[PDB]
């Protein structure tokens, strides 16, 4: 289904429409994504066991 037909399809009937936003949209809101959270966790843990400066 081409995007334009979907837009017409929605515009045609947007009164009755549930939305199901996943974690992808929050990606732009500036919130760290799943991968960003994973990398923050590794970095947070890696610096503590191996004593390294966090902000360096």
């Amino acid at each position: 289904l081409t995007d334009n037909e979907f837009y017409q399809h929605y515009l045609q009937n947007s009164q009755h429409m549930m939305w199901f936003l996943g974690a992808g949209t929050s990606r732009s809101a500036g919130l760290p994504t799943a991968s960003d959270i994973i990398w923050d966790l590794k970095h947070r843990y890696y610096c503590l066991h191996e004593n390294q400066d966090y902000q360096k």
Partner: protein, 456 residues
């Protein structure tokens, strides 16, 4: 009580190639993707010249000619990949030298071969190559050939022929890749061809490979020494090396003397503070002037109390100094059990005590072997059955075995002069040793710092 601290196996470091296509195995990555400097087109075409006695001239042509043809390995086939020639593998043409560039060793050298005078032979060879001083732009790498008949002056007490030749030629700024009968004396052609091809490409100015995802803000210093057997006492020649990565894409590798007389290999406060300040200025010059956040120092012997303070007083507070001593001779050795059919994994480091760890720089590596895919490869299986673990003694690092262990493991893979998978020591240590030999042979080098491409 038979329980030790949990060992951690550092993964095999990756090497950077053309188009930043990473690979652990250097030669295979060179075949598949090509040299690191190919994207910059830095060497362009490679132009090389000869300097040998005419009675062996043809030999040089032959090997150079055979540099331009494919070769299939017969020895160490479990590791070495099929050679494709300089034009194909390095994406760079190999230029046949013209008669103007080609030189002949002056006749009196042969005569002094009978005299057994190493200094005279080296000076005569330099004067033979003096015909190439003016035509420095025409050629990039010189191929000096020393015949087996000169073996009497090859090595003797207090003198090293290759060392003296390179010490004489380095201030003139023209690389040589000395070729002896050995290179044309072995059996596996692909091994020597990989060696000479990589050596020539790196000596021209290109970078065959670089450490993948290497931090540009860390400088890895390495200090080594050499013995000169003086008539009255002993002489210790200490020289340093740096393998930092500048803000650009290429990476640097420069050694220099630590200097008037030393009877012990331990740098005092003044000398160590001076060599580290020179290293700091060297690093600043490349990175526009930015401080190195952390500096790693690999010494073959332990750091003195004054020497540690000398290392500290040379840098600011932001710099993190991890003084490390590398020990090659240890009573420990490891056996891998699951009894593994192959030796203990390379990079497996075992923290023995506070500020003392065992690193297995030597060992089996996964996925590198070509024949029988999916099996470990032991590079030194010829020399011995086991891999001997080196030992790190920490002196200054605040914390973390991973930083030093991974840094050293990755550093043992960027020796272009080496045509095998890795080394026993980081390139800092081996190049500091090589330059220590060079300086010990020739005292009139202490003033200037030199790149790795000259002495490799």
């Amino acid at each position: 009580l038979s329980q030790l601290a949990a060992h951690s196996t550092i993964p095999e470091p990756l090497l950077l190639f053309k188009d930043n296509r990473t690979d652990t195995h250097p030669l295979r990555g060179l075949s598949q993707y090509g040299p690191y400097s190919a994207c910059f087109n830095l060497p362009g075409q490679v132009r090389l010249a000869y300097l040998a006695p005419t009675e062996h001239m043809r030999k040089l042509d032959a090997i150079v000619r055979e540099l331009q043809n494919p070769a299939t390995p017969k020895e160490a086939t479990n590791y070495y990949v099929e050679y494709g020639g300089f034009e194909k593998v390095f994406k760079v043409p190999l230029v046949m030298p013209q008669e103007h560039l080609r030189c002949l060793a002056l006749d009196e050298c042969h005569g002094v071969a009978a005299n057994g005078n190493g200094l005279a032979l080296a000076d005569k060879i330099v004067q033979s190559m003096s015909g190439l001083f003016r035509q420095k732009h025409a050629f990039d790498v010189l191929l000096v050939y020393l015949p087996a008949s000169w073996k009497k002056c090859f090595e003797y007490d207090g003198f090293d022929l290759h060392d003296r030749i390179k010490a004489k030629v380095a201030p003139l700024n023209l690389p040589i890749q000395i070729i002896n009968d050995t290179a044309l004396t072995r059996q596996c052609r692909a091994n020597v061809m990989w060696g000479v091809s990589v050596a020539l490409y790196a000596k021209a100015g290109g970078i065959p490979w670089k450490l993948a995802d290497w931090d540009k803000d860390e400088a890895y210093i390495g200090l080594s020494y050499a013995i000169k057997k003086n008539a009255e006492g002993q002489e210790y020649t200490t020289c340093c090396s740096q393998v930092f990565d500048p803000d650009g894409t290429g990476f640097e590798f420069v050694a220099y003397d630590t200097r008037d007389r030393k009877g012990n290999p331990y740098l005092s406060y003044q000398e160590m503070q001076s060599v580290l300040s020179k290293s700091l200025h060297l690093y600043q010059s490349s990175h526009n002037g930015r401080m190195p956040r952390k500096i790693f120092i690999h010494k073959t012997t332990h750091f003195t109390e004054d020497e540690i303070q000398g290392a500290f007083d040379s840098f600011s507070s932001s710099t993190e100094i991890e003084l490390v001593q590398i020990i090659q001779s240890t009573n420990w050795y490891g056996l891998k059990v699951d009894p593994a059919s192959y030796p203990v994994d390379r990079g497996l480091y075992q923290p023995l005590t506070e500020s003392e760890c065992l690193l297995w720089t030597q060992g089996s590596v996964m996925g590198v072997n070509q024949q029988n895919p999916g099996q470990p490869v032991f590079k030194e299986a010829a020399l011995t059955p086991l891999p001997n673990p080196i030992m790190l003694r920490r002196f200054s690092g605040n914390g973390g075995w991973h930083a030093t262990c991974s840094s050293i493991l990755a550093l043992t893979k960027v020796d272009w002069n080496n045509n095998t998978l890795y080394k026993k020591l980081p390139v800092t240590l081996v190049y500091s040793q090589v330059f220590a030999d060079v300086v010990k042979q020739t005292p009139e080098i202490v003033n200037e710092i030199y790149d790795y491409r000259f002495f490799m």
